[PDB]
Design a protein around this ligand. Structure first.
Ligand SMILES: [Cl-]
Lengths: 14, 14, 14, 14
Protein backbone atom coordinates (compact mmCIF):
# COMPACT_ATOMS: atom_id res chain seq x y z
CA UNK A 1 0.00 0.00 0.00
CA UNK A 2 0.91 3.66 -0.45
CA UNK A 3 0.45 6.93 1.45
CA UNK A 4 -2.15 9.14 -0.20
CA UNK A 5 -3.68 12.59 0.14
CA UNK A 6 -6.51 14.22 -1.82
CA UNK A 7 -7.75 17.81 -2.16
CA UNK A 8 -11.06 18.73 -3.81
CA UNK A 9 -12.34 22.24 -0.22
CA UNK A 10 -12.38 18.70 1.19
CA UNK A 11 -8.93 17.36 2.00
CA UNK A 12 -6.51 12.27 4.20
CA UNK A 13 -2.87 4.74 3.42
CA UNK A 14 -4.26 2.98 0.29
CA UNK B 1 -11.87 7.17 7.81
CA UNK B 2 -13.70 7.12 4.51
CA UNK B 3 -13.35 5.22 1.28
CA UNK B 4 -10.99 6.60 -1.34
CA UNK B 5 -10.79 5.55 -4.98
CA UNK B 6 -8.77 7.22 -7.77
CA UNK B 7 -8.16 6.90 -11.48
CA UNK B 8 -5.36 8.78 -13.16
CA UNK B 9 -4.48 4.70 -16.36
CA UNK B 10 -3.41 3.96 -12.84
CA UNK B 11 -6.25 3.04 -10.57
CA UNK B 12 -7.00 2.24 -4.54
CA UNK B 13 -9.23 3.94 3.52
CA UNK B 14 -8.62 7.76 3.95
CA UNK C 1 -2.16 15.89 -18.83
CA UNK C 2 -4.34 12.74 -17.98
CA UNK C 3 -8.09 12.19 -17.41
CA UNK C 4 -8.71 11.77 -13.70
CA UNK C 5 -11.59 10.81 -11.40
CA UNK C 6 -11.69 10.73 -7.62
CA UNK C 7 -14.03 9.38 -4.97
CA UNK C 8 -13.60 10.51 -1.35
CA UNK C 9 -18.72 11.22 -0.41
CA UNK C 10 -17.58 13.68 -3.07
CA UNK C 11 -16.89 12.33 -6.55
CA UNK C 12 -14.33 14.89 -11.56
CA UNK C 13 -8.15 16.59 -16.96
CA UNK C 14 -5.16 17.11 -14.67
CA UNK D 1 -14.66 24.28 -11.06
CA UNK D 2 -12.60 23.35 -7.96
CA UNK D 3 -8.95 22.87 -7.26
CA UNK D 4 -8.03 19.21 -7.26
CA UNK D 5 -4.71 17.75 -6.16
CA UNK D 6 -3.67 14.19 -5.48
CA UNK D 7 -0.68 12.35 -4.09
CA UNK D 8 -0.45 8.58 -4.09
CA UNK D 9 4.43 8.49 -5.58
CA UNK D 10 2.20 9.79 -8.39
CA UNK D 11 1.33 13.41 -7.84
CA UNK D 12 -2.21 17.67 -10.51
CA UNK D 13 -9.44 21.40 -11.73
CA UNK D 14 -12.71 19.36 -11.62
CL1 LIG E 1 -4.78 -1.60 -14.27
Amino acid sequence: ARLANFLVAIKXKV
